[PDB]
């Protein structure tokens, strides 16, 4: 039980009743008070944090609001059935500090749990949301972690998070393609409209290939994200 | 705890149990009583407001009822799962005052948080609702704030709210187009009906372009809203 003041832009979905401070999925703190400062829309949020985190609470502690995903229940308007909001934290060395400025978005993936953290560069985001799924042989082996525009305005950088035991699958010669939405074709002598993947329709997905003999890629190696399985076929440009 | 009387047109969704007064998303007041005056359908609503806002409570304080969005759950009839109503406020200089006349709609965006507030002029509103989303490279970088008919009856003025860190994206030569609903085409040698964006189907969306070398637009610069991506192609009129 302490008092920590965090300044936000917009106080949406922050209730003193149930708004936890989930450090790595662990309910550490609880929002106590929401007060306003009229200058430049400053919103002072008082937070009570437990004892062991208070010894870890230092100046380079980054706070950011976490909302639920862009889902089918969120776009339909069923606002009572989706879930609740929380705020997240990551402490650093810093200094002793009480007054914090909140962050605009989620920070970069820093921890090393054995997982693989590689970047994909696409000309646009596509149907991919944060939390869309990564497949190998139609088996979920990871997820999309974040997405951000690169400093040149041409591209979108999509960085994914392969699971720890599946790190051997990603190679230097792996190709990532996009499997999202439904495509229905009207073809001659029969028109095969076949519905294979149901989870890719609502949220989107990324599949990839693993070549036979290549070194395993690691440590933020970039990859091109093709828009289709037919665009990711190997071969010789002529 | 005070007493503030506000006169409304229709008392729909205003309960003494749970009807907050959300000033910038902060629960400041709570509706206490709803009484009626029979002349011209006057509805006297008594509101208890906290102490610090009472010192800020002055005559040019604009009250307006806020309802949830036009959503798929609101048109289906699931009235228990959508949410609740509230009223909003914005105080001004004015004078000391207790008796208020409510407003018909949301006031104009006044605060300067660093966000960009530009106007779009379309011949009709389209599938856009208040709260529909703004995309750049299929990344949500803003939202539609309000919509209003211009004084000539030809057009609809749609003013959007780009986020603070994405203000650099909007240029003077940016083009805004409308991506809303589903369009299915039957074409020769195959008919590619591809479903890309799921959030644009229910509520609607606006995407835009960023040209390479142009000055960044600012401060309520107008823009034309094209009805399609094919209508917003650059080129020379011949």
């Amino acid at each position: 039980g302490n008092t920590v003041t965090i300044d936000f832009m917009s106080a949406d979905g922050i209730v003193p009743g149930r708004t936890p401070v989930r450090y790595q999925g662990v309910e550490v703190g609880t929002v106590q008070d929401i007060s306003l400062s009229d200058d430049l829309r400053k919103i002072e949020v008082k937070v009570s944090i437990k004892s062991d985190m208070k010894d870890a609470l230092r100046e380079e502690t980054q706070f950011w609001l976490v909302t639920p995903k862009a889902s089918l229940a969120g776009v339909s308007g069923l606002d009572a059935l989706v879930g609740g909001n929380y705020i997240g934290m990551m402490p650093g060395k810093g200094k002793e500090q009480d007054h914090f400025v909140a962050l605009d978005t989620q920070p970069k993936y820093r921890l090393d749990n054995g997982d693989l953290m590689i970047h994909l560069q696409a000309p646009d985001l596509g149907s991919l949301n944060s939390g869309s799924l990564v497949y190998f042989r139609k088996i979920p082996v990871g997820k999309v972690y974040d997405y951000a525009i690169n400093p040149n305005k041409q591209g979108v950088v999509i960085d994914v998070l392969i699971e720890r035991r599946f790190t051997d699958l990603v190679k230097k010669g792996s190709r990532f393609w996009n499997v999202s939405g439904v495509d229905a074709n009207v073809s001659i002598s029969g028109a095969k409209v076949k519905l294979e993947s149901l989870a890719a329709l609502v949220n989107g997905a990324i599949a990839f290939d693993s070549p036979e003999e290549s070194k395993p890629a690691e440590a933020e190696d970039t990859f091109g994200l093709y828009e289709d399985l037919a665009h990711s076929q190997r071969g010789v440009i002529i």
Side-chain angles (χ1 to χ4, degrees), chain A:
Chain A
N2 295 115
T3 57
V4 174
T5 62
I6 303 167
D7 290 333
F8 286 98
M9 287 172 64
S10 66
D12 49 350
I14 299 170
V15 61
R18 53 177 183 89
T19 304
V21 183
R22 293 183 184 272
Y23 176 75
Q24 297 176 356
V26 176
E27 182 177 1
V28 174
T30 301
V31 173
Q32 295 299 109
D33 193 3
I34 294 96
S35 179
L36 58 95
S37 296
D38 54 354
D39 294 332
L40 295 174
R41 194 178 179 181
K42 187 183 265 79
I43 298 167
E44 184 179 1
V45 175
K46 292 181 181 180
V47 177
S48 66
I49 300 171
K50 293 179 177 66
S51 297
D52 56 353
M53 189 62 72
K54 178 68 175 177
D55 292 330
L57 188 145
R58 289 172 181 177
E59 194 272 332
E60 292 181 352
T61 301
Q62 295 175 354
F63 292 101
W64 68 94
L65 180 63
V66 180
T67 60
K69 296 187 290 183
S71 66
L72 195 148
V75 70
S76 296
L78 295 171
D79 291 330
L81 295 175
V82 174
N85 298 112
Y86 67 95
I87 56 173
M89 65 183 290
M90 285 182 183
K93 180 65 176 67
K95 193 177 171 64
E96 293 292 327
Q97 182 62 256
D98 198 4
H99 185 270
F100 289 98
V101 177
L103 272 70
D104 294 330
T105 185
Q106 184 177 2
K108 187 67 182 294
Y109 180 75
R110 296 291 184 184
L111 59 92
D112 289 331
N113 203 2
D115 294 331
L116 187 60
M117 189 68 198
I118 58 173
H119 291 90
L120 279 69
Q121 292 181 357
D124 55 354
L125 186 64
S127 179
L128 297 171
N129 291 318
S130 178
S132 67
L133 194 63
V134 178
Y135 290 103
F136 175 73
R137 299 285 185 183
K138 297 180 179 66
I139 294 171
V141 298
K143 68 182 178 67
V144 171
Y145 184 76
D146 199 359
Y147 56 91
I149 303 171
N150 44 359
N152 193 2
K153 304 296 181 182
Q154 295 297 109
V156 172
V157 174
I158 302 166
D159 47 355
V160 303
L161 185 65
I162 307 299
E163 296 293 326
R164 186 184 67 245
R165 65 187 183 274
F166 298 108
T167 56
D168 200 5
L169 298 176
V170 178
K171 302 291 180 67
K172 296 290 184 182
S174 296
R175 291 184 185 270
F176 288 83
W177 60 88
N178 195 358
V179 282
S180 66
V182 61
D183 193 2
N185 50 358
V186 178
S187 298
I188 54 96
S189 179
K192 293 189 288 184
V193 178
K194 187 180 287 186
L195 189 147
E196 296 175 355
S197 177
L198 193 276
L201 297 178
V202 180
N203 202 5
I206 295 171
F208 66 98
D209 194 3
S210 177
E212 185 68 29
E213 183 67 30
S214 294
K215 295 183 291 295
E218 78 275 14
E220 288 91 8
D221 195 1
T222 186
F223 291 100
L225 179 61
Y226 297 97
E227 68 179 3
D228 197 1
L229 177 58
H231 286 87
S232 67
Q233 294 293 322
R234 277 82 183 273
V236 174
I237 305 298
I238 297 299

